[PDB]
Enzyme design. Structure first.
Site, PDB file in Angstrom:
ATOM      1  N   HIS A  40       0.834  -1.080  -0.172  1.00 24.05           N
ATOM      2  CA  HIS A  40       0.068  -0.027  -0.063  1.00 24.05           C
ATOM      3  C   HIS A  40       0.841   1.425  -0.028  1.00 24.05           C
ATOM      4  O   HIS A  40       0.216   2.298   0.465  1.00 24.05           O
ATOM      5  CB  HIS A  40      -0.942  -0.042   1.197  1.00 24.05           C
ATOM      6  CG  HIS A  40      -0.266   0.249   2.455  1.00 24.05           C
ATOM      7  ND1 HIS A  40       0.069  -0.757   3.181  1.00 24.05           N
ATOM      8  CD2 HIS A  40      -0.037   1.430   3.040  1.00 24.05           C
ATOM      9  CE1 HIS A  40       0.715  -0.361   4.430  1.00 24.05           C
ATOM     10  NE2 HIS A  40       0.632   0.957   4.258  1.00 24.05           N
ATOM     11  N   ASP A  84      -0.009  -7.677   1.941  1.00 22.92           N
ATOM     12  CA  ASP A  84       0.579  -6.536   1.778  1.00 22.92           C
ATOM     13  C   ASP A  84       2.220  -6.421   1.849  1.00 22.92           C
ATOM     14  O   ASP A  84       2.820  -6.145   3.097  1.00 22.92           O
ATOM     15  CB  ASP A  84      -0.024  -5.560   3.068  1.00 22.92           C
ATOM     16  CG  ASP A  84       0.552  -4.072   2.851  1.00 22.92           C
ATOM     17  OD1 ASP A  84       0.697  -3.548   1.627  1.00 22.92           O
ATOM     18  OD2 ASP A  84       0.654  -3.503   4.012  1.00 22.92           O
ATOM     19  N   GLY A 175       3.199   6.415   9.171  1.00 20.65           N
ATOM     20  CA  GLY A 175       4.563   6.833   8.814  1.00 20.65           C
ATOM     21  C   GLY A 175       5.574   5.739   9.127  1.00 20.65           C
ATOM     22  O   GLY A 175       6.715   6.150   8.628  1.00 20.65           O
ATOM     23  N   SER A 177       4.725   2.520   8.052  1.00 21.80           N
ATOM     24  CA  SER A 177       4.418   1.587   7.161  1.00 21.80           C
ATOM     25  C   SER A 177       5.552   1.264   6.261  1.00 21.80           C
ATOM     26  O   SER A 177       6.319   2.218   5.805  1.00 21.80           O
ATOM     27  CB  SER A 177       3.308   1.652   6.137  1.00 21.80           C
ATOM     28  OG  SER A 177       2.138   2.082   6.853  1.00 21.80           O
ATOM     29  N   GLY A 178       5.732  -0.207   5.973  1.00 20.44           N
ATOM     30  CA  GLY A 178       6.789  -0.715   5.271  1.00 20.44           C
ATOM     31  C   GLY A 178       7.879  -1.085   6.045  1.00 20.44           C
ATOM     32  O   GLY A 178       8.943  -1.888   5.441  1.00 20.44           O
TER      33      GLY A 178
END
Ligand SMILES: [Ca+2]
Lengths: 223, 50
Positions: A40, A84, A175, A177-178
């Protein structure tokens, strides 16, 4: 990262920053040319920033490389955030040292209770708003599939794990994410979603990387 | 959703259309998007503001 502490200087070498004008997601360097992140976070144009500590000050260790290949998982579901995970190939290999290093992939899936390390430049507030210049750190254990599902009825898939505190207070946030969820030197999770941040009985949901080891290795071998 | 119909980012709760608190942890330049109703879509930032 809510309820964490500022990571030491050379403690998280594998952490990266996805930039598209500014920091919008985190990532992990698993090889001199590939980074893992959440799907995402996908954008047609992405610049990867490596060797960052203070994202607002140029400390001299940074490396800015642009994404060449941006591959999101084939079965990624934008409505459920299932599968994801995302692979990014650097148009140029990154220079490895102390500041920039890779992280290992899961040899096996992490067991409940395992202490993990989460890191990121996301909001450090579960209600207000405060984004830090320095990479934040947090240690949180992997929760049992059962409690994870008791917190998120009908929303937790087989490709998701809850890592955190049911008591609230500490958690990853917008902030983050990933970013990496390292347990034992192996990338076990990818910051994904959840209800707000650090909410009681609402731990953050992370992508279960150990279910993607095969997909990852294959994709890298083919590209 | 029961006597009503949920739209945009809305989530159905038996017979009422509330919405989500569910959000991906992306950092949105201008925050998350609102739809007709005013509720925030789970993982969609506002290119331009609201
Ligand atoms: Ca910097």
């Amino acid at each position: 990262i809510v309820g964490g502490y500022t990571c030491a200087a050379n403690s998280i070498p594998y952490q990266v920053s996805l930039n598209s004008g500014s920091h919008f997601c985190g990532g992990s360097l698993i090889n001199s040319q590939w980074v893992v992140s959440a799907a995402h976070c996908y954008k047609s144009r992405i610049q990867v920033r490596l060797g960052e500590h203070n994202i607002d000050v140029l400390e001299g260790n940074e490396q800015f490389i642009n994404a060449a290949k941006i591959i999101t998982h084939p079965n990624f579901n934008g409505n459920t955030l299932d599968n994801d995970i995302m692979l990014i190939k650097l148009s140029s290999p990154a220079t490895l040292x102390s500041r920039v290093a890779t992280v290992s992939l899961p040899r096996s899936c992490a067991a409940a209770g395992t202490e993990c390390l989460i890191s990121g430049w996301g909001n450090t507030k579960s209600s207000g708003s405060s984004y830090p210049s320095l990479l934040q750190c947090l240690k949180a254990p992997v929760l049992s599939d059962s409690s994870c599902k008791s917190s998120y009825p009908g929303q937790i898939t087989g490709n998701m794990i809850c890592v955190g505190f049911l008591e609230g207070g500490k958690d990853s946030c917008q902030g983050d994410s990933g970013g990496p969820v390292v347990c034992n030197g192996q990338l076990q999770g990818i910051v994904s979603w959840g209800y707000g941040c650090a909410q009681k009985n609402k731990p953050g949901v992370y992508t279960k990387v150990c279910n993607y080891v095969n997909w990852i290795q294959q994709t890298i071998a083919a590209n | 959703c029961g006597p009503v119909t949920c739209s945009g980012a809305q989530m159905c709760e038996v017979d009422k259309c509330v919405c989500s608190d569910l959000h991906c942890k992306v950092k949105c330049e201008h925050g998350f998007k609102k739809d007709d109703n005013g509720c925030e879509y789970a993982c969609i930032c506002a290119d331009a503001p609201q």
